[model samples]
Target: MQDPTINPTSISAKAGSFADTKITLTPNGNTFNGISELQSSQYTKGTNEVTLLASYLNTLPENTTKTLTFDFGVGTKNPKLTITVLPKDIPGLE
Candidate 1:
């Protein structure tokens, strides 16, 4: 399942911003197998969505303006998209 708002050109930032946040993805064997190699938080399953913790994602700093773009795993399609992180007041929207 793909979300138009959260494709390759978006940031999963805002809201929680690394305060114990989790990103969900489909559980295809190839996808699941790919995540296994990542090995961050045991990577358990949750119904149709694979529960992945963004513990690797950095905590939001206090009063900063430089935007953050997080690209995890070398040559991976995990989560099937690039998860970008933007500042609280800044968004690189087109």
Candidate 2:
């Protein structure tokens, strides 16, 4: 053995993190098994109306343009967002 140190954190994974999946998002026309997911952060308690919003982590490489489709429980037509990851060489105001 080269150097067998007990490495639980690096090798192991969070068991409960991947469970209880609700919905999925489509990226670049991969609608069948769209792996991207959207998460919500809401403030509630007022039954009449409440503020709500959602977010997704931009994991795609820079300078890539793709159509990102959002999701909910069920709907006739879902919404889509055009995302263009700005490159490092993007111009800035002087």
Candidate 3:
């Protein structure tokens, strides 16, 4: 068995002032445990963003790759991005 994980799970972006925000994650895989979106509460613009999979990491399938499409602006104006996720094993998490 392999442990599922997201790399660069935490992300951040700068755009004027920062006060945390919510982003949506649309994955092509069959997981996420009903979590099609994620949120952040204390992220600064130039600092760092929060992780998407908090406690729902178990929903992801092991030894798989998921393509995640991030909707940053919620259709406002920000450009959307697509990221690839490959579940791997952690040091001691297994």
Candidate 4:
């Protein structure tokens, strides 16, 4: 699942969809805090091709935009994700 938005020409990523789903952030040295929670889903032990998106209320900050692309296996396929966001926290988020 390659996205068309990723720029091969530009040095910096166009800041949109990329197959690289993960990003790493360092603590840039700041203070002032409340209880912030980072949460994920209840995907059990044996789930594959699961919905990494869909029905999920994005926890991403307001005014920020993002796009997602996936590549699960070999072959050119138009794959999409589907999820059911529970009214409560994701299944095992205690």
Candidate 5:
């Protein structure tokens, strides 16, 4: 029988001024079975940008829920972006 243990393949937080934020899968050490790349920039007041990507691996499991709560501070701009997970192959999609 296989052990029923589940841990976050990776955990990261982005707060403060940063650009081109990226999260990738490590090469070794019980790394994430799957990979999800997310990007966000909340520099401008009232505006925020978010991008997300994921490789093979189930994100939804039994008895648990994962929420990607992007921490956007107040006082942004008019620009806005939304991120959603999609398959590898899609017309003009990333």
Candidate 6:
């Protein structure tokens, strides 16, 4: 999803809806701070997509790409999305 309110050009993603969804974060090539797998019950929504403050995404390194995997946990395909971190900007903090 593209939210101009977050990044005018790049795509922005959020973790709002899920069904037994589990998220995995891999940066550079290692489990990010013991949070390699996140349960659906752990998600915390935020206003901006980039900041997904829900999990560990809020603290990701800037100007770098990370591998993210999402598991729907019900005979669904495991999809991975690579995200390049950008500087955090609050929705109306500009």
Name the top TM-score candidate.
Answer: 1
Candidate 1 residues 14-45, lDDT tens each? 42264443444433322233343334343344
TM-score of every candidate relative to the true structure: 0.34, 0.29, 0.25, 0.22, 0.21, 0.31
Sorted by lDDT (best first), the order is: 1, 6, 3, 2, 5, 4
User: Which candidate, 2 or 6, has the higher lDDT?
Assistant: 6
Q: Compared with the true structure, what per-residue lDDT tens digits does model 3 show for residues 1-94?
A: 2122222343322221122233433332312222233222211121112233322332334433332323332333222232222244332243
Q: Rate the local accuracy (lDDT) of all candidates.
A: 0.36, 0.28, 0.29, 0.24, 0.26, 0.32
In the range 1-94, model 6's lDDT, one tens digit per residue, is 2111111222333322212223333222222222133332234322222123334444444544544433323112223445544544432243
TM-score of 3: 0.25
Model 5 lDDT tens row, 1-94: 2121222233322221122334322222221222122222221111222224232112322222234333322112211122232223333433
User: Model 1 off-target regions past 4 Å?
Assistant: 1-10, 14-16, 19-31, 36-38, 42-48, 59-79, 87-89, 92-94
lDDT of 5: 0.26
lDDT of 2 by residue, 2-79 (tens): 121110111111221222223323233322212133222321112212221221213334545433333322222343
Residue 21 in candidate 1, Cα distance off native in Å: 4.3
Evaluation by lDDT, superior candidate among 2 and 4: 2
Clashes of each: 0, 0, 0, 0, 9, 0
**TM-score between candidate 2 and the true structure:** 0.29
Compute the lDDT of residue 56 as modeled in candidate 3. Answer: 30
Tens digit of per-residue lDDT, candidate 4, span 1-94: 3322211111212222222232211113321111111123411111222222222234333333232222223114322122122333324434
TM-score of 4: 0.22
The true-versus-predicted C-alpha distance at residue 28 of model 6, in Å, is: 32
Largest lDDT belongs to which candidate? Answer: 1
Off by over 4 Å in 5: 1-47, 56-63, 74-94
